[PDB]
């Protein structure tokens, strides 16, 4: 029983809309285009927020011959630590970083940043796939049909799916408060006041 595929997700979205399942995706003669665009848009909307499975740490960026930083096509957000660079303030603009404080598009040295990428469908994990599918189906039905009872049922299912996805994310990636900013290499032992008293 392998992981969910794109065709299975499209079939689930159509079924939640209330139509008959479709055979394939290629050269379809049905709603495959609408299902595909809905799934892609919801995937992008979920990914652009930034989670633990699509974020890189302390990645180096290299400038071009004109001292200008150009991002890739699928870079959603770029964060620069303030304390490390007290004289430079950057904000993403289109596909180039912008030196907000000095009002320049040029830099003096390479940077160490942490960026969030948007991933293709094939590379997503299972819980992300589930949440994406359910949210896309709800959005498509709400925009297309607009009935009442179907909207209620989709609302309940979406709430349950969001709860499950958030719980899975947090138990996988073990967020903590003592460690503080994650860019610091872990000095924490998280010793357990619940065990060693005997």
């Amino acid at each position: 029983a392998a992981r969910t595929s794109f065709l299975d997700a499209v079939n689930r979205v159509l079924q939640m809309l209330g139509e008959a399942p479709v055979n394939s995706l290629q050269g379809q003669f049905g709603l495959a285009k609408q299902a595909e665009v809905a799934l892609n848009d919801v995937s992008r909307t979920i990914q652009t927020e930034g989670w633990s499975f699509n974020t890189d740490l302390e990645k180096k960026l290299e400038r071009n011959s004109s001292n200008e930083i150009e991002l890739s096509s699928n870079v959603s957000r770029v964060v620069v630590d303030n304390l490390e660079y007290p004289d430079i303030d950057v904000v993403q603009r289109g596909d180039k970083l912008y030196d907000r404080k000095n009002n320049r598009y040029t830099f003096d040295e390479d940077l160490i940043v942490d960026m969030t990428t948007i991933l293709e469908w094939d590379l997503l994990p299972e819980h992300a796939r589930q949440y994406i599918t359910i949210k896309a189906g709800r959005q498509l039905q709400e925009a297309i049909i607009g009935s009442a009872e179907l909207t209620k049922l989709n609302l309940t299912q979406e709430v349950e799916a969001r709860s499950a996805f958030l719980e899975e994310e947090t138990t996988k990636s073990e967020h903590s408060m003592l460690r503080g900013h994650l860019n610091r290499t872990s000095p924490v032992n998280t010793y357990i006041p619940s065990r060693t008293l005997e």
Binding site: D8, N11, A20, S24, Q26, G27, E70, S72, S73
Partner: protein
């Protein structure tokens, strides 16, 4: 002919438009390589785009080549890991799905055959797959007896041994005049 791959050596720097003739299924199934660099599909900062409103369909880079005679390759690779059709129960079977499955299988077979031909291909008059005027390389230095020789091995220090020399040619044409050649190690002579 090359079914689904066109390799072109760029004539001049600054050129951006290239053409192709093979059929395809999706605009995302076409890959372009520029001297080992991989270019992502899309529009905008994406460094190449596809154009289909003109026959033949043509691709367009988003930045001209720095120097001329830089190899540019266009190759079509359909899906190999994921099938394009997955039959689900309760649907209305239409001929379009079957035709698409047939087309996908045919295109995969064509691409594999073209890749095999692009590799070393049989020399019909002899039999060993000929390299067809290419420099086979990336073979490590010989390890066993029958292992072939490489440049860094045949020009390596210490490769001189006591077997492979012959006679009948050695003359002054390359012997260093200033070299101090040992008289005893040199040959004999009778002065009548």
């Amino acid at each position: 002919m090359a079914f689904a791959q066109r390799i072109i050596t760029s004539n001049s720097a600054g050129d951006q438009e290239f053409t192709f003739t093979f059929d395809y299924i999706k605009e995302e199934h076409i890959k372009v390589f520029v001297n080992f660099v991989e270019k992502a599909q899309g529009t905008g900062s994406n460094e190449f785009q596809v154009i289909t409103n003109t026959t033949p369909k043509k691709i367009s880079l988003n930045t001209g080549l720095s120097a001329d005679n830089t190899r540019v390759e266009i190759r079509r690779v359909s899906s190999l890991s994921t099938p394009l059709v997955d039959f689900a129960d309760g649907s209305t079977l239409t001929a379009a799905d079957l035709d698409t499955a047939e087309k996908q299988s045919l295109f995969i077979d064509q691409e594999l055959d073209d890749a095999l031909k692009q590799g070393i291909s049989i020399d019909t008059s002899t039999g060993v797959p000929t390299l067809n005027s290419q420099r086979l390389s990336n073979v490590s230095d010989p390890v066993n007896a029958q292992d072939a020789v490489t440049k860094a091995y045949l020009e390596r220090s210490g490769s001189i041994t006591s077997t492979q020399i012959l006679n009948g040619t050695i003359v002054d044409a390359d012997i260093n005049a200033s070299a101090a050649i040992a008289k005893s190690k040199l040959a004999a002579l009778n002065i009548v």
